Structures are given as C-alpha cells and as structure tokens.
C-alpha cells in the first residue's frame, strides 16, 4: 500500500502535490504545466520549445554562469521537456537540497532574462536540432504521424516548429507566451521522495505566490480534433530497418473508454527480438511475428490528449520483403479485438495491467511524473484502489464494443519510413481493417 498523495492549493490557484517515501534519500520536485506546443498558433509555433532552451540561459539575479554553478553546488540536476500538451521542469536533488531547487525553479520560470543576445545564440542551436532529430527514427515516425493524423490542426504541429519561426521568434513573443500560459491555475508543483508536504507548501508560498492567475480559470486538464485517415511514406532505400506506425483516433484522458483502450492495447502488446523472454509471450501477434521473423519489434501505444488520442502500433523490421505479411497479420490481430476476443484474452491483459500501471512507478522521477501527469490531465491523482476497480470493470464485451466503434473498418493514419517498398498502398492497408468473413 503506497502512501497517500497529499494535495494543497495556494491562493493564486497553484496546486501542490506530494508523495513522500521515507525509504529514499533523494527527492524530485518540479512544476508540471498544463500547456505545451498545442497552445501556440501557426505563427509562434516553436515558442514553447524555444523557451525551454532560454529558461536555462539566466535570470534577473543569476547569470547563465551563476545558474550553472548554483545547480552544480546543489548536487543534483535540473531537467525539462515540452510536449504537445504538457511542459515539465523538475529538479532531482538530495533530501535537504529541496529548498534550493524549488528556489531555482521558481527563478527560471518567473524571472528569466530572455536577452536578445541569447535568443540569437539559441536560434542557431535550435536550427541545428532540426537536422539531428532526423536520426531518432521513432520520433521522426511519430512526429509525422501526428502531422498527418491531425492534418492542419494544433495537435498536428511539431514541437520544434518550422525553420521560418525559429528565425523570427522574438523575446516579445516568448514573454507573451509564458505570460498567457504559465499561470498558477495551470501549474502543479510536485514533490516525490524525501519531501515533506507541509514544507513544500511553505516553499510554494515563498516562491510561487506572485504568479499571475488566468482571467478565466478552467479546471486542470480542460481542452476541435478531426482525425484524417492518411499516410506519409518517407521511403529511404539506404536505411536497413523499416519503421512503420499505424494508428486510429484513440481516446482522451477523460474518456469513459480510457481503460478499455489500455486493455485492448495490452492484448496486442509489445515484442522485441532482443529481449530473451519475448519469444514466449502470450500475445497472438507476438507468436506470429516471432515464428516468422517478420519484425525486430513492435510496440502498441495508446497516446492520450485532452480531447483526442492515437491508438496504434509501431513496427520495426529488417525483413523488407515481408512487410506486407507483418502489416497484414498485425491488422488482422486488431480485427480480432472486434470479432473474437473472449474472457481469455481480456482477463489475461487485465492481470498484466493491474501490475503494469503500478510497476512503471519505480524511482522518484517516475512517481513525480505520475503525480504531475495525472494532476494536469484529470485534476486529481487516481488511487491504486480506483485504478484496480476501473480495470476490473472492463469486460470482454466492453473491449469488443470499443473495438467495433474505434478500430473496425476505420480510417488509419499510417507512416512508413525506410525501405518500405513492400508496404502496399493505403487502400490495401485500410482493407485489412475489416474481415470479409465476419
């Protein structure tokens, strides 16, 4: 039984949420913000990611160099990431170095210099990042997958933004973004590990009390996405491994089908030829793929956003002549979520998930990420008891019903990268989304 997640508010509306673990000696405090790339328009797309690079380039008090030294002297580190709907800034430290870290975080968020000289310096750093993500194939595939699934919509935009915006982002636009978006009612100060809740609330009253509140305070995790069945092929015959993602419109965080979608995802599961145990996994697709060497790996995913999601699978394969088989068999396994799944598969996947949702939470950073994510998407931390009850409520009938409404005969977004000559055209892929025998 995990210790209770304590939650308090400030006057401005900043949420403070903490989960203490007196077994560890390190703590992760940070700020989860319900804001990300999605909050930009097309002209300032890239701002959020730009800011993340400039948050560390010095404040009104500490210069870039002083900042470096201050964190080095703490002992731990700081880390940040911006996604489409969420921005996170956290600091991992020692138990008694938490007051220093909260102070540094408060400083870099509220009182950042954003000096023209530093904007101009980062403008090249970020321009060079455009030509080096090119190597991270998984991210290339998923960025194109969002681009196509949510064609010309806010979720479809990249995080880095187009080259053109990087050259034209001013300190004015940066200032305006963090003034409009980084408001107290959209932020959660999270602490996990060796933190006292009451100590953390005091530190929040000391550092984050003069945060702006938004004009119209909506609750945390408040949102129109119109998925486009589509494909991007980025054929590259010189690449040895093909990477393919296939996705349908998935479920939002607050969907009633959120757990049903997770169970369905677990029925297909993951596979990796590099892991020893994978050849023995229960998943039907895992068996087909391992016996036939159709793939190096596959990873089912169910990504959620505030108002939509993608649910699908990401496949990697060197077997370039049998990609057709790999995709064929994959989509026919999805068909079986609609036609065939029984309590056997559903109960197996529920068992796997009942543990899986808890096993992910290892160290303090994972716990902090869990508290932060849940608070900024649902407005509360869901207790393991509630999670266990919601999973238990998923029946075979629910999985079939969900698949028949979500997957069966539905448009897909499909991205192929690499030697994908063998991947058939959109129609033949989409034709595998139903079974004529059923």
């Amino acid at each position: 039984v995990s210790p209770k997640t304590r939650t308090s508010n400030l006057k401005n509306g900043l949420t403070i949420a903490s989960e203490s673990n007196p077994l560890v000696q390190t703590a992760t405090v940070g700020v989860w913000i319900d804001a990300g790339s999605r909050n930009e328009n097309a002209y300032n797309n890239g701002t959020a990611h730009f800011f993340e690079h400039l948050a560390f380039k010095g404040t009104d008090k500490r210069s870039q160099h002083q900042l470096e030294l201050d964190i080095e002297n703490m002992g731990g580190h700081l880390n940040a990431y911006t996604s489409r709907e969420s921005t996170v800034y956290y600091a991992k430290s020692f138990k008694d170095d938490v007051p220093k870290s909260v102070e540094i975080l408060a400083d870099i968020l509220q009182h950042s210099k954003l000096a023209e000289s530093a904007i101009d310096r980062e403008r090249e750093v970020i321009t060079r990042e455009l030509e080096e993500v090119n190597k991270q194939y998984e991210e290339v595939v998923f960025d194109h997958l969002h681009a196509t699934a949510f064609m010309n919509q806010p979720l479809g935009r990249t995080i880095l933004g187009p080259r053109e915006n990087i050259q034209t982002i001013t300190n004015t636009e940066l200032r305006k973004f963090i003034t409009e978006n980084y408001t107290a009612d959209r932020m959660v100060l999270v602490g996990a590990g060796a933190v006292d809740h009451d100590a953390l609330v005091e530190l929040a009253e000391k550092y984050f009390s003069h945060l702006p509140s938004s004009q119209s305070p909506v609750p945390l995790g408040t949102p129109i996405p119109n998925f486009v069945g589509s494909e991007v092929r980025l054929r590259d015959d010189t690449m040895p491994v093909a990477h393919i993602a296939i996705a349908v419109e998935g479920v939002s965080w607050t969907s009633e089908d959120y757990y049903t979608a997770l169970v369905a995802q677990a029925i297909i599961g993951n596979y990796d030829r590099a892991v020893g145990t994978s050849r023995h996994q229960g998943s039907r697709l895992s068996n087909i793929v391992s016996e036939n060497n159709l793939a190096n790996s596959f990873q089912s995913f169910s990504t959620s956003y505030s108002d939509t999601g993608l649910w699908g699978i990401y496949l990697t394969s060197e077997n370039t002549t049998q990609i057709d088989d790999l995709v064929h068999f994959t989509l026919k396994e999805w068909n079986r979520l609609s036609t065939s799944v029984s309590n056997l598969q559903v109960e197996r996947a529920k068992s796997q998930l009942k543990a899986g949702l808890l096993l992910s939470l290892d160290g303090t950073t994972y716990v902090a990420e869990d508290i932060g994510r849940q608070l900024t998407t649902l407005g509360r931390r869901v207790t393991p008891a509630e999670v266990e009850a919601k999973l238990e409520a998923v029946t075979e009938h629910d999985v079939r019903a969900w698949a028949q409404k979500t997957l069966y005969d539905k448009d897909i977004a499909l991205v192929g990268l690499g030697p994908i000559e063998g991947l058939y055209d959109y129609n033949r892929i989409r034709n595998d989304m139903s079974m004529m025998r059923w």
Binding site: G282, N287, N343, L344, E347, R348, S351
Partner: protein
C-alpha cells in the same frame, strides 16, 4: 499421429506386466519382419520429417548424428534403386538401432503442446 502419443502409449504398455509380456515379443517380431534393418536404416530414420516440428528436431541433432543420418539415407536410397539388400556391416544390428531422434522430437513437441495449452488458459 504425434511421437508424443506413440511414446506415451508405449510406456503404458511397458508398465503393465501382462501387457508387456504379450506385446514385447510381438513387437520384436514385427520389427524383424518390417525389414528396415536390411537396408541399414535405424527405426528413427523412417519417421516422416516434412512437418515443422520434425524439421526443428532434425536441426537440433548433434552434427555427427546428423551427418551419419544423411549417410544412412543415401546408402538406403542406393540399395533401393539397385534392388539389393545391405550385407555385413551395413545391416543394422538390434544393438545399433538406437532412438537417436526420439528425445529431440519429444522436446520439440512438448513445447508445441504446452504452447497450445497455454494459448487456451483461463484466469480463474
């Protein structure tokens, strides 16, 4: 039928004293009249191998056993086309008729049958 089935049934017979007393002598004469030994085959050389399970078992044979099996098949094929029988050292003596393959196929099948069972398990 599966080698597993054949082996299990045979073990049921060899257990029962009565059954073995009447079956063992019959089976020995059967094998003598079968006459595969007259072409220099071992019993296991005759087992149908065009199944995925048996292909796997054959791949698992130690190199030496494998090379000798190939020789016995080639030699037997040559006796067959010549309409001759083995003579002398080419005839399989009863002591040389070892079940070299049975352990490998039993292991292959054991895993394939476990796989079938486990594909049908129901969380209680």
């Amino acid at each position: 039928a599966s080698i597993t089935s054949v082996v299990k049934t045979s073990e049921l017979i060899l257990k029962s004293p009565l059954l073995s007393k009447i079956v063992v002598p019959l089976a020995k004469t059967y094998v003598k009249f079968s006459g595969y030994r007259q072409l220099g085959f071992k019993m296991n050389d005759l087992i149908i191998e065009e199944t995925p399970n048996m292909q796997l078992a054959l791949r698992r044979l130690p190199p030496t056993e494998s090379y000798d099996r190939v020789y016995r098949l080639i030699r037997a094929t040559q006796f067959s086309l010549s309409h001759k029988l083995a003579t002398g050292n080419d005839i399989t003596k009863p002591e040389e008729d070892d079940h070299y393959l049975i352990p490998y196929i039993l292991d292959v099948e054991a895993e394939a049958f476990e796989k079938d069972a486990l594909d049908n398990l129901e969380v209680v």
